[PDB]
């Protein structure tokens, strides 16, 4: 009792116990239970970090200040430490000697109250080895008779499983559900606690920063609850301000500082959290358009969806954007995705849907490894979005995917949040969703089997309607078709590849003078209607880089470049100039 | 205070090596130590990474004064678990000592208790303790506690409990980069050199870090680097009695690593040019069969090591096929023996069940700590620089083949455990017996037809077309020749002759017997596998029986021959 119990009332006089802000309903229910003739033992059941221990400690603080009824005045709260009580016993009755002595003290003082945080531990044998003489059994007669008043704090899961098993002890305690009040009430709570934290770090927190902390924490720090998470970011912000600046630097904690702290906790790049991306958004459409030629309606659709979400017009609960890319292979479907990711700077997550074809493999994306194995694994999709809140999810050959996969995406697009089988809540509202399918290209490219060529303009949409359920299509923002690359745009594609090679050669010092006529011949072989531009990679490297590269390493001309290329009608080959 | 040792006072008197690097990790600890709540930091790092030393660095900063004024007057202490557990003999006596020290620390403010190997004191663990007093000091916030715990035993002790995790902040302490590690040695070079007055060349210190991670593969390179350096310096100090070789070279460091590795000095030494140059010669010496395959395979290895400008992909992806036991496995084991690497063996026939596929990349039954994990993935992590042997690849489930494509193309594998493997150095080899099976079957016709088929077409039926393009070169074994099998019989009997030499009895075998044993033992369908059974039961049974009870108890002098009419071996013994 000398060291196991710390008088909270005495402690509050000096300090330590932080003020409790806005828990009248909770305290009123507790004061009512404490006033009961029998079984006047409150229990505080709530999730982690939701102010369970602040109410008990806060009650002592409120008593000292006279904010409680007269019946509760002249009341002392004692905070029993179970670990101290179970340390140093090393004997048959050392635990019972000290524990019973504590009860005698409480019995002597009618108004004394015992606060036992993490009360689930008493059910566990305190000092009982192969015996049932536990702490809980010893206090069961006293709680029933109202001799002592006990306040306990334990989590819902611990309360449901560890507690409530012994219906005897559970009966004495009166469950009081302690839930997080709101995103807005937490701001008021931090205001009350702000002076203590400000004094510790000798800094002042701006009004905008405190509100930003709560709001930024909810978006990214989802593992913990609102009161603790907001305070933790605030605490870390002051500490960084103490160590980072040497001296005579801004003491005030700016809003940008809060974003840096929350970014490291969430391992975010710290660029997405900030709203300084307006400059990139200004010319995002034009910049992306020059990077990939043709299919302009796709880049504008992507930029418009991102631009609206960053302007306050984004969906409240749905993702930033859901899109389906229906077009021939190698028409820039994956190009707009990767180039968008690079310009924005966010990651590009890619998942091959050909792998997830059977029913047994659908669980992988939204389930932990088979059985109950693997540590920080979760669903394959869930850990990627949790790891990167702002990213670009890419799915290729979605049509091949099992029907059960589409059912998973329905809640994603409709609600914007995905819950893994493990139990964690994955919230990915910033990630844009893009799917690439080749369903319609097959029907449009193939001609009708008949003397008359039937109209295939509407045939492509018909396949998508039957292949994709109406519910799935309704959630999608828009369906964009990637059209075959015309000869005009095809010239731009070869220009990009050859210019790219020129840049690489420029550092080496080699120069090229490829003719415009050579571009036309390269385009026909490089681009195929069925395979698109995927074979074009080899044509540029093999026709241009490989002959010259071999000569560069060992050839007639060791170095000096000044190479030229021209089409050869008879040989259909490219000329190579060797000027030292 | 007697149990613990003040690191802050220790720095004043010296004996603490100047920390180099980990500026970000060190700065992180100071930031959390200045927190109003949850100030207690944690150091999640593997053994040898340098988690204990980074805490020592903080004490040096305080003495140096390059920290805020809040921590300038602070002190740090190191809990000695051994001192507390010294002679108590009862659980609870230990706790009393801990409480007394806490009160001594509590009276004086700005005191930090660095608990090294915190995992041992808290939690039940696997291989004692109470853990009752660690919780109140954390909740009281009076004295900050720095706890060093390994990655393993941290998920089963800290993540499982909210109280400890809530009050502790996790600091990921990864191993330093090779460039960073060599810089540390330069920082620590004046202290080691002053002990024995030897000068280390820049090449030797850089080589030690590079070679240590490649060969030891036991603990992290920072601890390994200091060990080989100190060991070489100590060895050099006293290696020559007459000569005081104050200079150091790569020759000395190579021998030191060889001793602990227990691998030949030539293999451990950075003699890749020498080993690759004589790779074929060393391999051809022991095994003289399938010279055509060896010549193609030997050249493929030298060019493979170069990488042709692509290193992310696995260096070795050669596939072997042909009749069973005709040298498919001998070359692989002999290749490893010459190199000195530890050969691994996995039979794909065994892993022909979907449940078995999970065994390779995890455990279907529930395991604690996932120590066993994947049968193959864990072994790769254990010995990355080792060859992987696969048997009966043809008889494998289709899904398994998909995983193989990722290894050669992606260059990395992800499983439930999540451990990454550097497949770049990893080599791969496979043996296919399907080809020989096609020629053994007989066609459904009145007259049989030639069953010889191109090796390329056979692979297409059993293997996906997206694998032969990514492979370097295909090697196929058609069949052995009379001259090769005959010579092999002579080599095998030598083992029996060597065995008999220790026993003290000689043996003599006629040339006719050697030729007769080759045709019967060798089988086209089964290669040379039945030859060992045929030769062993024939020769071993009669000699063993006589050696125990008979004229051959001592002396030997045996003679073997076969009558032409009988066409059966005859055994003659002389007392």
């Amino acid at each position: 009792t000398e060291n196991f119990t710390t008088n909270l009332n005495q402690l509050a006089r000096v300090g330590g116990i932080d003020p409790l802000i806005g828990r009248e309903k909770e305290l009123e229910r507790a004061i009512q239970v404490l006033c009961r003739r029998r079984k006047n033992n409150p229990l505080l059941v709530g999730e982690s970090g939701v102010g369970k221990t602040a109410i008990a400690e806060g009650l002592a603080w409120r008593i000292v200040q006279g904010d409680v009824p007269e019946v509760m005045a002249d009341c002392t709260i004692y905070s029993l430490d179970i670990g101290s009580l179970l340390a140093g016993t090393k004997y048959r009755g050392d635990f019972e000697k000290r524990f019973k002595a504590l009860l005698k003290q409480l019995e002597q003082d009618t108004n004394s109250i015992l606060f036992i945080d993490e009360i689930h531990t008493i059910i566990g044998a305190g000092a009982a080895s192969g015996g049932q003489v536990d702490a809980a059994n010893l206090i069961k007669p006293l709680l029933s008779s109202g001799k002592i008043r006990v306040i306990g704090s334990t989590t819902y899961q611990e309360f449901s499983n560890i507690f409530e098993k012994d219906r005897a002890l559970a009966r004495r305690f009166q469950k009081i559900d302690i839930t997080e009040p709101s995103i807005e009430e937490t701001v008021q709570i931090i205001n009350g606690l702000k002076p203590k934290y400000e004094a510790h770090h000798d800094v002042r927190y701006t009004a905008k920063a405190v509100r930003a902390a709560v709001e930024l924490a909810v978006k990214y720090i989802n593992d913990r609850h609102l009161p603790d998470k907001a305070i933790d970011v605030i605490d870390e912000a002051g500490a960084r301000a103490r160590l980072m600046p040497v001296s005579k630097r801004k003491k005030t904690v700016n809003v940008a500082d809060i974003e840096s702290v929350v970014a490291r906790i969430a391992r975010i790049p710290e660029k997405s959290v900030s709203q300084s991306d307006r400059d990139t958004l200004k010319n995002l459409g034009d910049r992306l358009k020059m990077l990939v030629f043709g299919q302009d309606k796709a880049i504008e659709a992507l930029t418009e969806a991102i631009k609206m979400a960053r302007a306050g017009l984004g969906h409240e609960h749905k993702p930033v954007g859901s899109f389906l890319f229906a077009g021939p292979t190698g028409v820039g479907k994956t190009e707009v995705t990767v180039q968008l990711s690079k310009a924005l700077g966010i990651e590009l997550l890619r998942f091959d849907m050909s792998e997830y074809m059977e029913r047994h493999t659908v669980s992988r994306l939204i389930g932990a490894p088979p059985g109950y194995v693997g540590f920080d694994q979760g669903g394959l999709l869930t850990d990627a979005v949790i790891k990167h809140p702002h990213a670009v999810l890419l799915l290729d050959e979605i049509e091949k995917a099992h029907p059960d996969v589409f059912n998973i995406l329905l809640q994603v697009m409709d609600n914007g949040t995905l819950t893994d089988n493990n139990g964690r809540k994955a919230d990915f509202r910033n990630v844009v969703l893009v799917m690439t399918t080749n369903a319609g290209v097959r029907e449009t490219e193939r001609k009708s089997i008949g003397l008359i060529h039937q109209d295939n303009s509407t045939d492509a949409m018909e396949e998508i309607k039957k292949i994709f359920t109406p519910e799935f299509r309704n959630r999608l923002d828009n369906i964009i078709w990637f059209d075959h690359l015309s000869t005009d745009v095809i010239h731009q594609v070869v220009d990009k590849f050859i210019v790219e090679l020129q840049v690489q050669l420029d550092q080496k010092g080699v120069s090229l003078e490829v003719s415009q006529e050579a571009r036309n011949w390269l385009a026909e072989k490089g681009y195929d209607r069925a395979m698109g531009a995927r074979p074009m990679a080899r044509v540029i490297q093999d026709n241009l880089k490989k002959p010259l590269a071999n000569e560069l390493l060992f050839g007639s001309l060791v170095d000096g470049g000044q190479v030229t290329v021209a089409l050869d009608k008879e040989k259909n080959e490219l000329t190579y100039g060797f000027q030292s | 205070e007697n149990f613990t040792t003040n690191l802050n006072q220790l720095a004043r008197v010296g004996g603490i090596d100047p920390l180099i690097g980990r500026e970000k990790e060190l700065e992180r600890a100071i930031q959390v130590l200045c927190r109003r709540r949850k100030n207690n930091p944690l150091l999640v790092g593997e053994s040898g990474v340098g988690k204990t030393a980074i805490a020592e660095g903080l004490a040096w900063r305080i003495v140096q004064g390059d920290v805020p004024e809040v921590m300038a007057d602070c002190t740090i202490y190191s809990l000695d678990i051994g001192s507390l557990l010294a002679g108590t003999k009862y659980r609870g006596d230990f706790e009393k000592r801990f409480k007394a020290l806490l009160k001594q620390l509590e009276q004086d403010t700005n005191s930090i208790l660095f608990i090294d190997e915190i995992h041992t004191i808290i939690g039940a663990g696997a291989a004692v303790d109470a853990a009752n007093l660690i919780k109140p000091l954390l909740s009281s916030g009076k004295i900050r506690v720095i706890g060093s715990t390994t990655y393993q035993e941290f998920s089963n002790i800290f993540e499982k409990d909210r109280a400890l995790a809530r009050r502790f902040q996790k600091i990921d302490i990864t191993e330093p980069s090779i460039e960073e590690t060599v810089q540390i040695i330069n920082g620590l070079k004046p202290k080691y050199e002053a002990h024995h007055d030897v000068r280390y060349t820049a090449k030797a210190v850089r080589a030690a870090v590079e070679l240590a991670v490649k060969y030891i593969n036991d603990r992290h390179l920072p601890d390994k680097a200091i060990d080989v350096i100190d060991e070489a310096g100590a060895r050099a100090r006293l290696m020559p009695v007459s000569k005081r070789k104050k200079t150091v070279n790569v020759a000395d460091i190579e021998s030191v690593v060889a001793r602990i590795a227990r691998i030949p000095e030539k293999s451990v030494s950075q003699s890749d040019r020498d080993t690759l140059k004589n790779l074929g010669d060393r391999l051809k010496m022991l095994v003289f069969g399938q010279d055509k395959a060896i010549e193609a395979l030997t050249e493929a290895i030298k060019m493979a090591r170069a990488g042709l400008g692509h290193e992310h992909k696995p260096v070795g992806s050669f596939l072997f096929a042909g009749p069973t036991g005709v040298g498919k496995t001998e070359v692989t084991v002999q290749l490893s023996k010459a190199l000195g690497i530890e050969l691994l063996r996995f039979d794909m026939s065994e892993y022909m069940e979907r449940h078995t596929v999970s065994r390779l990349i995890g455990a279907p039954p529930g395991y604690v700590g996932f120590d066993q994990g994947g049968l193959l993935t864990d072994a790769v992590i254990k010995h990355p620089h080792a060859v992987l042997l696969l048997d009966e690849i043809e008889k494998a489930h289709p899904d398994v083949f998909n995983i193989l494509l990722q290894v050669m193309d992606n260059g990395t594998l992800t499983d439930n455990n999540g451990r990454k493997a550097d497949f770049r150095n990893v080599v791969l080899v496979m043996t296919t017996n399907a080809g020989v099976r096609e020629t053994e079957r007989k066609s459904i016709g009145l007259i049989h037809q030639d069953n010889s088929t191109d090796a390329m077409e056979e692979i297409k039926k059993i293997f996906t077309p997206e694998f032969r393009n990514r492979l370097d070169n295909i090697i196929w074994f058609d069949h052995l020749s009379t001259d090769v099998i005959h010579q092999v019989v002579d080599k095998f009997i030598v083992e029996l002759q060597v065995q008999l030499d220790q026993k003290g009895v000689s043996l003599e075998v006629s040339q006719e017997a050697r030729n007769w044993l080759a045709e019967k033992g060798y089988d086209r369908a089964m290669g040379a596998r039945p030859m060992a059974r045929v030769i062993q039961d024939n020769l071993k049974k009669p000699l063993a029986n006589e050696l125990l009870f008979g004229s051959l108890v001592d002396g030997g002098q045996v003679t073997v021959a076969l009558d032409k009419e009988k066409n059966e071996l005859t055994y003659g013994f002389q007392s």
Partner: peptide, 11 residues
């Protein structure tokens, strides 16, 4: 955990 203890007087 519960173990009996036998004492001895000084004299």
């Amino acid at each position: 955990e519960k173990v009996r203890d036998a004492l001895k007087p000084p004299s």
